[PDB]
Amino acid sequence: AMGKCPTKVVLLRNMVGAGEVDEDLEVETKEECEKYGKVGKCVIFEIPGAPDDEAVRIFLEFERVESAIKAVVDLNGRYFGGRVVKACFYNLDKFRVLDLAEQV
């Protein structure tokens, strides 16, 4: 399963519900993720017709795979507000061309 293959890209699901993206999330999440290592800005995609705990996909690309691993381990099961976040990896090549709806 593709979400289990370690890469420098982390996918966060269930942060917020469908249509509930805001800029505060992206700013805070990038700051939080700098704890694991250098990281780019959040890249956000919402999947049409998805369940409320899957619709919003937040991607962050770390500079180093070790940081991404640390991020998956620390963020999976942590709370963002009241929501329990699901964290996994994402394929780098799919990410770079903005293919953001792959099964993980």
Partner: peptide
């Protein structure tokens, strides 16, 4: 800005 990430407990 809102702060929502919570520490693990």
């Amino acid at each position: 800005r809102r702060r929502r990430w919570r520490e693990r407990q």
